[PDB]
Amino acid sequence: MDKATLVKTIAYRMGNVKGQDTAIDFELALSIERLEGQEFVPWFLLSENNFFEGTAQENRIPVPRGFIREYEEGSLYLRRVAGTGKCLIKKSQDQLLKYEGMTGEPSHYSLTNQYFRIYPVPQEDFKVELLFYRKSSTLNVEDNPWYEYAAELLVAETIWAMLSARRDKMADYWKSVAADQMRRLTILDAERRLANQEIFMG
Amino acid sequence: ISAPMNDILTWLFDSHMYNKRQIMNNQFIGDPSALVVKDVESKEPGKFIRLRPTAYGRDVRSIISQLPVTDVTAQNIQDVQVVERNMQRIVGVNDDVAGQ
Amino acid sequence: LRPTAYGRDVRSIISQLPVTDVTAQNIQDVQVVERNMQRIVGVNDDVAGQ
Amino acid sequence: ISAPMNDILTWLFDSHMYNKRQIMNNQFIGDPSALVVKDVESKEPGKFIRLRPTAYGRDVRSIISQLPVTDVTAQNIQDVQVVERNMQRIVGVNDDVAGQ
Amino acid sequence: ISAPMNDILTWLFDSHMYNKRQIMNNQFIGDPSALVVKDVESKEPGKFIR
Amino acid sequence: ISAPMNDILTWLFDSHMYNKRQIMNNQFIGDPSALVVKDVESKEPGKFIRLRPTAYGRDVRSIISQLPVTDVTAQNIQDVQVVERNMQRIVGVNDDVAGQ
Amino acid sequence: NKKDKAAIEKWNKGDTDFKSLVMPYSYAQLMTAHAYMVNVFLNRDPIFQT
Numbered sequence: 001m002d003k004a005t006l007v008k009t010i011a012y013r014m015g016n017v018k019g020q021d022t023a024i025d026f027e028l029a030l031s032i033e034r035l036e037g038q039e040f041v042p043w044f045l046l047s048e049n050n051f052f053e054g055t056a057q058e059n060r061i062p063v064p065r066g067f068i069r070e071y072e073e074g075s076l077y078l079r080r081v082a083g084t085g086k087c088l089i090k091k092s093q094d095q096l097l098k099y100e101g102m103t104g105e106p107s108h109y110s111l112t113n114q115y116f117r118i119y120p121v122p123q124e125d126f127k128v129e130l131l132f133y134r135k136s137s138t139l140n141v142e143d144n145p146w147y148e149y150a151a152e153l154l155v156a157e158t159i160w161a162m163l164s165a166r167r168d169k170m171a172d173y174w175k176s177v178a179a180d181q182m183r184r185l186t187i188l189d190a191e192r193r194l195a196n197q198e199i200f201m202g
Numbered sequence: 203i204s205a206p207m208n209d210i211l212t213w214l215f216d217s218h219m220y221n222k223r224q225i226m227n228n229q230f231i232g233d234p235s236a237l238v239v240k241d242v243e244s245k246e247p248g249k250f251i252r253l254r255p256t257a258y259g260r261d262v263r264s265i266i267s268q269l270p271v272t273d274v275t276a277q278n279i280q281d282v283q284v285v286e287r288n289m290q291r292i293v294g295v296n297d298d299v300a301g302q
Numbered sequence: 303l304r305p306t307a308y309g310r311d312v313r314s315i316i317s318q319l320p321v322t323d324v325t326a327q328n329i330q331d332v333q334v335v336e337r338n339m340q341r342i343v344g345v346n347d348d349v350a351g352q
Numbered sequence: 353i354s355a356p357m358n359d360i361l362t363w364l365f366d367s368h369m370y371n372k373r374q375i376m377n378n379q380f381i382g383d384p385s386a387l388v389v390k391d392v393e394s395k396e397p398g399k400f401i402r403l404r405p406t407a408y409g410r411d412v413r414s415i416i417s418q419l420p421v422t423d424v425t426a427q428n429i430q431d432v433q434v435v436e437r438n439m440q441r442i443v444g445v446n447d448d449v450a451g452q
Numbered sequence: 453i454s455a456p457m458n459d460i461l462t463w464l465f466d467s468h469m470y471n472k473r474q475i476m477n478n479q480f481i482g483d484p485s486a487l488v489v490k491d492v493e494s495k496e497p498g499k500f501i502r
Numbered sequence: 503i504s505a506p507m508n509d510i511l512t513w514l515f516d517s518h519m520y521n522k523r524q525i526m527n528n529q530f531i532g533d534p535s536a537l538v539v540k541d542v543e544s545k546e547p548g549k550f551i552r553l554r555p556t557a558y559g560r561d562v563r564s565i566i567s568q569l570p571v572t573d574v575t576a577q578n579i580q581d582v583q584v585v586e587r588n589m590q591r592i593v594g595v596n597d598d599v600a601g602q
Numbered sequence: 603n604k605k606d607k608a609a610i611e612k613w614n615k616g617d618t619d620f621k622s623l624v625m626p627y628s629y630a631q632l633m634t635a636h637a638y639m640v641n642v643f644l645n646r647d648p649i650f651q652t
Binding site for chain 2: 303308309310311312313315316318321326329340345346
């Protein structure tokens with residue numbers, strides 16, 4: 001679906017409302033903003049490979065712009081000039097204070113709020129790569145992913161907001177509908193991921 | 203003279219061996235969704251297989267368990283011993299009957 | 303477990319049928335009949351002797 | 353003459369050994385969230401693994417446990433012993449037959 | 453001639469020794485909040501952890 | 503020649519001994535409020551530890567208990583015995599080999 | 603092994619840890635054999651006899 005069909009469907013299923021059209025757009029943007037803030041991150045918010053170049057003597061690497069989380073089946077990889085690389089390992093900061101002053105290529109990291117820290121402090125310019133989840137507004141894709149893949153969740157959520165202001169009791173119903181849609185969306189994510197995968201112990 | 207009995211012995215051995223082959227390997231049955239996979243597949247000595255968030259309250263046993271297998275054809279050994287004694291009796295090379 | 307069964311408990315689904323041979327005690331009975339056979343023929347006989 | 357049998361012995365030893373390799377290491381399954389991690393990773397003799405602030409009131413027993421593993425291929429030893437006796441019989445170097 | 457076997461022996465010993473090293477130390481799991489701490493850390497013979 | 507091995511023995515003894523030092527003493531865990539204290543601290547042969555007035559009706563079993571401790575490093579003894587046998591083999595002073 | 607350098611460091615500090623080794627068995631057997639041969643041939647009183 002697209003924005004026009006979304007607005008038309010939201011207006012139709014809210015009681016064939018016709019006067020309001022701008023509030024629907026406002027609460028449709030706010031619905032996406034609210035959904036991005038919750039704990040569950042769908043698969044379509046995963047970014048592409050991004051590389052960062054940094055100066056010598058700074059261990060702090062700022063977090064990418066729309067960072068929500070770090071991809072679990074992903075890693076921070078150092079790309080050496082020759083094209084080879086190693087995967088850096090995450091530990092807590094307390095655990096990485098032994099290394100201050102030991103010298104070499106970077107080998108470990110910690111995330112502390114807004115900064116990735118490379119504790120084996122490089123003495124020369126480096127380059128790292130990362131895969132992570134991002135807010136949509138920052139994705140480099142043609143249309144909002146949400147519109148294509150999670151359209152029903154979006155409609156219900158928008159309706160709740162609009163109705164809650166008018167004080168209808170229908171709202172709770174639409175919140176339950178949205179909760180069911182999100183519950184179903186979570187299962188697909190797993191299925192999509194776990195498809196054609198065989199697990200061996202050890 | 204002993205051929206009929208020898209066969210009974212080969213049958214017993216082969217059956218036992220074929221049933222062991224099919225089931226005696228360590229294997230596990232589990233729910234793929236609840237765990238982070240790369241962790242399952244590591245042989246390092248101490249390793250924590252981290253559960254994904256949803257199963258935080260589930261009985262751990264339920265998530266991964268090992269299938270139980272038993273060989274019921276493992277007692278064929280007592281039967282082998284009888285047939286062999288009976289074979290010593292027909293041929294008479296080292297026999298029970300002469301003096302028990 | 304298959305997708306449609308993602309949340310099920312593993313223990314319930316598969317099990318091995320239990321089997322027992324009740325005719326496996328015929329061995330004690332064989333031993334008696336053989337002793338009785340030694341008595342009729344008298345080749346290696348329990349009688350005559352304690 | 354004995355090669356057919358020897359080969360059976362090699363198969364048994366190899367199977368047991370491979371199944372051991374796969375599952376023996378001691379590993380634990382657990383919920384990452386409930387505990388403070390650096391504590392888990394210490395080998396000091398007496399150490400209290402503290403529950404994290406968000407889990408201050410939880411019961412300790414539930415959070416971490418060790419996966420149970422068993423080798424079902426560990427009884428292949430009785431079977432080895434039989435095949436070896438059978439091998440002594442064909443060759444006749446140290447043979448059960450001829451003698452009670 | 454014996455080299456191939458000797459190795460199998462070294463592997464067995466080393467694995468065992470490495471797995472013991474990692475887990476065989478007495479350690480406890482607990483809720484920090486419920487107890488007065490200095491009490492936990494005393495080796496005196498009779499002590500009441502309040 | 504044997505030093506690499508001896509050192510393994512020293513590590514084992516020391517580990518066991520340190521883990522014992524830490525946890526062996528007999529200690530009790532309890533609720534201070536429920537009992538009259540001077541009573542707890544008496545070594546007389548027969549003594550009734552009275553519940554305090556505010557706890558007059560409580561069940562006695564619940565209030566005080568002894569923490570359970572075990573030494574898991576107490577089996578290092580079987581391991582010591584193996585390493586010693588292996589040491590007799592390298593040096594050859596009292597050696598298992600040459601003899602059945 | 604990689605883990606070994608750490609262990610050596612502990613030992614220097616005063617502590618104890620596990621450093622790896624290769625099991626003796628094979629050596630013992632060679633040595634037992636060499637002895638058989640020395641006794642049979644060399645330790646005799648005449649050695650070369652006619």
